[PDB]
Request: fold
Amino acid sequence: DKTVRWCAVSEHEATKCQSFRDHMKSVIPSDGPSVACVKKASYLDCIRAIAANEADAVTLDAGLVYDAYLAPNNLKPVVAEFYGSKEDPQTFYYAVAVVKKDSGFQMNQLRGKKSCHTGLGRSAGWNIPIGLLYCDLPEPRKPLEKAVANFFSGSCAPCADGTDFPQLCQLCPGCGCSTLNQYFGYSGAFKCLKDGAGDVAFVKHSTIFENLANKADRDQYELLCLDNTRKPVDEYKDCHLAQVPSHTVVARSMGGKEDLIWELLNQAQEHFGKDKSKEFQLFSSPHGKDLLFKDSAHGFLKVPPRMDAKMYLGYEYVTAIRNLREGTC
Ligand SMILES: [Fe+3]
Reply:
């Protein structure tokens, strides 16, 4: 029955957030939940802000959910996105490696190629791919960024430190950590491949379909499978790197307004969910892709009482992330 300060990362999400606020004002009764928009430069500033009681919520890729839980932030997942459809809700998605047809190389031949990542620490764009190549990277493997920059002959790893790891922003100077960087996120990583800046793009299964509407254009891209073979992009179920947890909304563990967050999102998905309204769309926008929430999401599911980041992500996934920051071969 009160205000939820949503954290928007940069200008594009801020605009979508303002529209979200305005439309909710015209559908929700005077005594219903409302939205306020707090603009920050990166997802990292959003995490600090929430922990500092400057904002209340933000949606994060699962990989980033782990960081959010560590002290002194101690945020917890309260609401998760679900994909697929309302009839068959999927609380996970597939991480894939997209390349152009006949580029002439397999998964075990990535050394020296140029890579495009959605962002440092994210599930599909970093943790899965780098987790699988870990023992392929040259030594020392510490720091991780260092060895990654030496494996590929140039890449775009948004949010990485370009001062110490220049090679990680060769394809996107500055390694901007928001949509101001044309190569940020799923669709940014895809564009990086499409434009020809990189040789491979680590994204999710729906990315190409979200960007190329003619099957004729998609037939010019393939997927790299673990068994060093290539398959068409429609065959991701038989050619993916891993299954990762859906993105989730995080909030403070104390005075986190988790009840209001859910009330707001549940009502938001009622009035503005998929195909629900002509005035405003929660899972789409003319100002960009994957703003505030992923375009591929179909709705929200409440997370069980007091579930911590570790239990939510699962031991397996949480294992991989640890093995990446410590890792041995
Ligand atoms: Fe993701």
Remarks:
- The first helix runs from residue 10 to 25.
